Write a protein that binds this ligand. Structure first.
Ligand SMILES: CCCCCCCCCCC[C@H](O)CC(=O)SCCNC(=O)CCNC(=O)[C@H](O)C(C)(C)COP(=O)(O)O
Ligand code: SF4
Ligand code: SF4
Ligand code: FES
Ligand SMILES: [Zn+2]
Lengths: 84, 95, 112, 206, 126, 48, 687
């Protein structure tokens, strides 16, 4: 099944969000140029867990928590959430 | 002037009237709604303006300690009736 | 913290069960002697429901103060000081309870 | 000056000397001594302090504070122990008055003074009904001034002024029944605290 | 008695005599009240206060009075510290919304800067 | 008032209505205010 | 750089450049004031603040003195108390005695100072002066007899309101304050003159005599209807909204408020939806119950599914209502969630929170040198940001540049062009202002949400983003100082962009829905011309102007004084309106209506309390439960690299907001359109 809304929750000063912050720093742009129609929301909050709330269809909201996850792990998580 | 509604209800001088479909009129059947004949809006138009020579007048409502406090009304604008905000007796300059 | 008469939860539950013993002896004399209306099984069920209303708490301080309050209701119902109407105030038969579902609470007013 | 009430310092210095004497005789068992203006001596003691401090004030030769005026909580919710339980004593010989304070909350009680002062046998019932402050060693501690089933001690500041239970007669049960309270007119609470500093000596530090 | 020690958050939720509708559906505030702006005072802003959630207040069918069913709507509770007010709200069981004290930052108000040679902060009124 | 009469004003009542409870002449209370919340009337025409 | 200052024996270390008042405010002793506002300039006029300065024989004013070195200010001394009682006696010499007349009954600042600081009995037996009243406007009723000539109004109108109209005429007791000719003093921020005025000389005209501040109950909320998001004390008397007052929070609004949101409280009791209405078989709108109305919504919502069920929000709508409505339409999986005003969707619309916020802080507008403004009039659209920009223009040497629609601001603003092609001209670099910004350190550009209502709004965003990238090339700036920011005129727009609603009406004009249903929308962009014939529209809202007479079933929601709701300003800060007066009759809260709609349909929304709605708000976007905190946020560089590949063109028209002058400032978003107060404002302005 397809995907409708990606939703990345960040923390800006927590050290467990450094990989997903670096992923948004260096390769968010070609992800948007690959998928411009579906929104990938980036919301930021201090002292919160890093999250990957994905909304597919009919209210299906699947959650991935990515505390202490690096750049290769968060791009693997984005790849298997884009695949299904 | 006590006005009358299409339901026959006397209009209270603040402007209160009950609507024709209102259920709060059923306290008025076999009884009466009190409205005074002496309307406080209409009981100041019979008062004449006071032609005085003072640039600033002092008003107390008559009696000294009987009425309102002794406040001071400007009369410089001759095209406007300088009123006393406690009472409403209109004052005007002589010239 | 300096405690009230029941030191721990086991002694507090022991005094709770002694107070429930005194209420279970108390109810048939109350229904027979007050010229009451309720069933005596309904009265014992209401005593059990009023205990299960407050039986979600941990602290032996507030359990022993609830024992003190229940002993006051106990002595006010043994010595006939709580009347027919004062006993029947616990049932609340003049008033249907507020609806637990969301739709009738939406309909009946502005209640959160 | 006829507006101001005249102040005599002789009662203030003898109450300062007597408060020094009571804090000298009970060093384990008196926390604070306040000889206030208007010439009243307040002695603030422990929740364990109440039985031997009031036995000392009743039975001592220089004290002789035999008559107890009132037992009274005040409820200040900004403290850790909310209820200041006070005991006003009265010397029938020495013509003075001690205002003994002690602190409590609802979960740490005080031993009651019925074993020394049988004046307070109804005052304990008054303050336990009124504030939820339990007392030990009482003959029959009971809610007296609220109803037979009035759940909630009313003089606490967390209790509302209106209450929770109203009463109404019902013809359905042919008895007077309790209802949850609703009012024909609300309590129109004002904000009468003026925003300026009323007394410059009574100011809290920031 | 003898001293005990229990590791539990204290609650007196069952002995204040509140109904269950007035302890679970409510929200209290823990707030420094703001100064009324036509006034210029500090003595309302000094102490913390505790107001409840404002429930409904309908018109009376007799003469349009404020008729209400919420008896905690007229309740305001004074305090002296945010920690004691939060501990009071935990010990009574109501859910709190805590708003911090909005202290005024002290401004660089000088009379000599009102009359400048080059700056735009000149006052033309005096 | 045969000896010393009171002051007579132009709004005052020339006849004393007596105490009049349980009569068709009767005080009953009401709001002395207007409608504070003005409603929104529907239009007299449909959308099409 | 600290000075040891004694205040009755204290030891306060205060920085130089201070006053005796700002020295004593660290102690907690408040020297009494009438002339000195905290946020106005120093001008010692009222002379109430006199204290003695440790044994110098002249008492000195607490407004003017810097405390030099080691002075002991005896605040509770015999000489200072005699000075205060003497100055209160001289203030109450010629004060006419209209305290039962007065609007400021408990809110008089001079009743309280005469009650706590003056004498007991006045020895005045002579005769008071009387001053002719003025005609400043239908908002500020001026009874100038009781004016104490303290000149707090003329410094506000000369420095922060920027109108230059209120100044003093004459001398002595014949000196009177006001407009000398019959001038309608009617600008923006003209209602803050009332709360500045410590006397009840000039007060509010719609709140003339209706209530009294000891009787009113003072609740707290945030603003709507301008997107600056100001803190508001709603003072309510017996379940009736009586005053709206500003509340001090030094970032968003430093004791000011605009006239629209402080005299649009009278909108809330006029032309208001109370009962649910249903399209009858004849064609009218008849009053029914919720059990029939939401059953008809559920019966026409179970039929149409998938993609042709849409909703347009906008205006006065909570960020809880958009959460409940977004789950309500995501469980019927249609993302056509549109808004009233248009933000561009071509590059990073709902994504990347630095493309639609105020990334400069509103306190950090003071920490800037160049402010360049494209598009909007900030004097009309969010006037309190223009009040902050006038304070930053006064108190430090801040230079202003304005692009498009030359409109008289409260300052001189160095107008560059009426075109969007000069954005590309500055981006290439040939203008003189590129050299001017090269001679400066901290710039900020702002881009209001009325230039984004144009056809080339995405072209404006691409050109302004590349221009501000060349500005960051030209100026060496810190990464904590973001420079590109956007203001708004609708409070719900930033909340919908935070929750991921697609802005504009692009989805509606692309796919016309079989069942749109609009949530509080009253902007003139959407009607039954881009839609099919039946189309089953709801108005889930209040104050029917456009969206309710063109509706099918009307659901009355609550307003901004009427619910515990979350609203976001342009800063990204979301605060909570607390409920003050509940909505009248059958009207409920918006999330309550949407959750009951989900219950009466076959859907199951997982809400039962407002705290569960805040928990779902934590799940969906975790900035809108965090209160009174702008969350620090970034990634403008990836937004700029994203939008550099967007190839769009501007066209040569002068960009201009719809609020050109003040005659259409006073009527926005269906509350000021519905009131009679703002109708009197437009009637006063246009004549
Ligand atoms: C009808 C008119 C008259 C109406 C008159 C109504 C009278 C009401 C009186 C006031 C209330 C009353 O005091 C409340 C009370 O006695 S107690 C509440 C606290 N309850 C607990 O804390 C239970 C804890 N639970 C355990 O300790 C263990 O789970 C276990 C049960 C297994 C121990 O088992 P063991 O012992 O075997
Ligand atoms: S402003 Fe003047 S008239 Fe009004 S209450 Fe104050 S002193 Fe009285
Ligand atoms: S109108 Fe008010 S602010 Fe202006 S000088 Fe008079 S008292 Fe002061
Ligand atoms: S307060 Fe200083 S002169 Fe007015
Ligand atoms: Zn008069």
């Amino acid at each position: 099944l397809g995907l409708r809304e990606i939703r990345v929750h960040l923390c800006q000063r927590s050290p467990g969000s450094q990989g997903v912050r670096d992923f948004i720093v260096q390769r968010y742009v070609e992800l948007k140029k690959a998928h411009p129609n579906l929104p990938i929301l980036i919301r930021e909050c201090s002292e919160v867990q890093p999250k990957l709330w994905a909304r597919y269809a009919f209210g299906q909201e699947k959650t991935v928590s990515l505390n202490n996850l690096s750049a290769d792990e968060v791009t693997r998580a984005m790849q298997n959430v884009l695949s299904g | 002037g006590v006005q009358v509604s299409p339901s026959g209800e006397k209009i209270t001088h603040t402007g209160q009237v009950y609507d024709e479909k209102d259920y709060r009129r059923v306290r008025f059947v076999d009884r009466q709604k009190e409205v005074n004949e002496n309307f406080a809006i209409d009981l100041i138009a019979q008062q004449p303006v006071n032609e005085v020579e003072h640039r600033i007048i002092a008003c107390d409502g008559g009696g000294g300690a009987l009425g309102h406090p002794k406040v001071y009304i400007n009369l410089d604008k001759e095209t406007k009736t300088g009123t006393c905000g406690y009472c409403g007796l209109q004052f005007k300059q002589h010239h | 913290v300096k405690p009230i008469f029941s030191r721990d939860l086991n002694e507090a539950k022991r005094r709770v069960r002694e107070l429930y013993r005194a209420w279970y002896r108390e109810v048939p004399n109350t229904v027979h002697l007050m010229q009451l209306d309720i069933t005596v099984k309904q009265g014992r069920d209401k005593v059990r429901e009023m205990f299960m209303k407050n039986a979600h708490v941990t602290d032996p301080r507030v359990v022993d103060l609830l024992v003190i309050k229940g002993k006051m209701e106990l002595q006010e119902t043994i010595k006939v000081w709580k009347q027919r109407t004062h006993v029947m105030r616990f049932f609340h038969e003049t008033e249907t309870p507020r609806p637990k579902d969301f739709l009738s609470k939406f309909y009946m007013g502005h209640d959160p | 000056r006829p507006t101001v009430r005249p102040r005599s310092d002789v009662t203030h210095k003898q109450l300062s000397a007597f408060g020094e004497y009571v804090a000298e005789i009970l060093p384990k068992y008196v926390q604070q001594v306040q000889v206030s203006c208007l010439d009243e001596l307040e002695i603030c003691i422990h929740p364990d302090g109440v039985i031997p401090t009031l036995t000392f004030l009743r039975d001592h030769t220089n004290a002789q504070f035999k008559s107890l005026a009132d037992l009274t909580a005040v409820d200040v919710p900004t403290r850790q122990n909310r209820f200041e339980i006070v005991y006003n004593l009265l010397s029938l010989r020495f013509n003075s008055r001690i205002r003994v304070k002690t602190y409590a909350d609802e979960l740490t009680p005080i031993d009651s003074i019925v074993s020394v002062h049988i004046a307070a046998n109804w005052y304990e019932r008054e303050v336990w009904d009124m504030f939820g402050v339990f007392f030990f060693n009482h003959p029959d501690l009971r809610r007296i001034l609220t109803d037979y089933g009035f759940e909630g001690h009313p003089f606490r500041k967390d209790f509302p002024l209106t209450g929770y239970v109203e009463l109404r007669y019902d013809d359905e049960v042919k008895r007077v029944v309790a209802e949850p309270v609703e009012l024909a007119q609300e309590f129109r609470k004002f904000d009468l605290n003026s925003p300026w500093e009323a007394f410059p000596a009574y100011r809290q530090p920031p | 008695t003898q001293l005990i020690t229990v590791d539990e958050k204290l609650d007196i939720t069952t002995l204040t005599g509140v109904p269950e509708e007035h302890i679970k559906t409510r929200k209290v505030r823990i707030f420094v009240p703001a100064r009324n702006n036509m006034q210029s005072g500090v003595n309302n802003t000094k102490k913390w206060k505790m107001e409840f959630d404002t429930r409904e207040r309908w018109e009376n069918p007799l003469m349009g009075w404020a008729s209400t069913a919420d008896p905690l709507s007229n309740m305001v509770l004074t305090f002296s510290a945010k920690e004691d007010a939060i501990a009071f709200a935990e010990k009574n069981g109501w859910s709190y919304d805590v708003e911090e004290k909005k202290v005024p930052k002290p401004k660089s108000k000088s009379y000599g800067a009102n009359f400048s040679w080059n700056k735009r902060t000149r006052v033309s009124t005096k | 008032p045969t000896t010393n009469p009171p002051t007579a004003r132009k709004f005052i009542w020339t006849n004393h209505k007596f105490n009049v409870s349980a009569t068709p002449e009767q005080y009953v209370p009401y709001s002395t205010t207007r409608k504070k919340i003005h409603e929104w009337v529907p239009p007299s025409t449909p959308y099409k | 750089n600290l000075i040891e200052v004694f205040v009755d024996g204290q030891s306060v270390m205060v920085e130089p450049g201070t006053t005796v008042l700002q020295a004593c405010e660290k102690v907690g002793m408040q020297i009494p004031r009438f002339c000195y506002h905290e946020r106005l300039s120093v001008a010692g006029n009222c002379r109430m603040c006199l204290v003695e300065i440790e044994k110098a024989p002249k008492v000195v004013a607490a407004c003017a003195m810097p405390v030099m070195k080691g002075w002991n200010i005896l605040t509770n001394s015999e000489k200072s108390k005699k000075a205060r009682e003497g100055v209160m006696e001289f203030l109450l010499a010629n004060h006419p005695l209209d305290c039962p007349i007065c609007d400021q009954g408990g809110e008089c600042d001079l009743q309280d100072q005469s009650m706590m600081f003056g004498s007991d009995r006045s020895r005045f037996l002579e005769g008071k002066r009387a001053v002719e009243d003025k005609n400043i406007g239908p908002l500020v009723k001026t009874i100038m007899t009781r004016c104490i000539q303290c000149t707090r109004c003329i410094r506000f109108a000369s420095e922060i309101a920027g109108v230059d109209d209120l100044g003093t005429t004459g001398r002595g007791n014949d000196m009177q304050v006001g407009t000398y000719i019959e001038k309608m003093f009617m600008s923006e921020l003209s209602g803050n003159v009332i709360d500045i005025c410590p006397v009840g000389a000039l007060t509010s005209k719609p709140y003339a005599f209706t209530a009294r501040p000891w009787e009113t109950r003072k609740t707290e909320s945030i603003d709507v209807m301008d997107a600056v998001g100001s803190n508001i004390v709603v003072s309510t008397r017996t379940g009736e909204v009586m005053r709206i007052l500003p509340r001090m929070h030094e970032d968003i609004n430093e004791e000011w408020i605009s006239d629209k949101t402080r005299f649009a409280y009278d909108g809330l009791k006029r032309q208001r939806l109370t009962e649910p209405m249903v399209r009858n078989e004849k064609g009218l709108l008849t009053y029914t119950s919720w059990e029939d109305a939401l059953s008809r919504v559920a019966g026409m919502l179970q039929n149409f599914e998938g993609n042709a069920v849409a909703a347009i929000a906008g205006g006065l709508v909570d960020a809880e209502a958009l959460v409940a409505l977004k789950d309500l339409l995501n469980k019927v999986d249609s993302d056509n969630l549109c808004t009233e005003e248009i933000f561009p969707t071509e590059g990073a619309g709902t994504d990347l929170r630095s493309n639609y916020l105020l990334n400069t802080t509103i306190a950090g507008v003071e920490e800037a040198d160049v402010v360049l403004l494209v598009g909007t009039n900030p004097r009309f659209e969010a006037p309190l940001f223009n009040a902050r920009i006038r304070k930053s223009w006064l108190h430090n040497d801040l230079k202003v540049a304005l692009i498009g629609s030359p409109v008289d601001l409260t300052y001189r603003y160095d107008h560059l062009g009426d075109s969007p092609k000069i954005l590309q001209d500055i981006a290439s670099g040939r203008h003189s202002f590129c050299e001017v910004l090269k001679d400066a350190k901290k710039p900020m550009v702002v881009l209001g949400s009325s230039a984004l209502q144009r056809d080339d709004g995405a072209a404006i965003l691409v050109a302004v983003s590349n221009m501000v990238q060349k500005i960051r090339v030209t100026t060496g700036v810190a990464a904590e100082w973001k420079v590109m920011n956007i203001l708004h005129r609708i409070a719900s727009q930033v909340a919908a962009l935070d929750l991921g609603y697609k802005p504009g009406v692009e989805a509606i004009r692309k796919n016309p829905p079989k069942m749109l249903f609009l949530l509080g929308a009253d902007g003139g962009c959407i009607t039954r011309q881009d839609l099919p014939k039946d189309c089953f529209i709801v108005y889930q809202g209040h104050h029917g102007d456009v969206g309710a007479p063109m509706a099918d079933v009307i659901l009355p929601g609550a307003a901004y004084t009427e619910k515990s709701a979350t609203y976001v300003n342009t800063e990204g800060r979301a605060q909570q309106t607390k409920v003050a007066v509940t909505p009248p009759g059958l009207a409920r809260e918006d999330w309550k209506i949407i959750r009951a709609l989900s219950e009466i349909a076959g859907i199951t929304l997982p809400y039962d309390t407002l705290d569960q709605v805040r928990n779902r708000l934590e799940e969906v976007s975790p900035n809108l439960v965090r209160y009174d905190d702008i969350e620090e946020t970034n990634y403008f560089q990836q937004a700029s690299e994203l939008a550099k590949l967007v190839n769009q063109e501007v066209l040569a028209d002068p960009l201009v907001p719809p609020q050109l002058t003040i005659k259409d400032f006073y009527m926005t978003d269906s509350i000021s359109r519905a009131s009679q107060t703002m109708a009197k404002c437009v009637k006063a302005v246009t004549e």
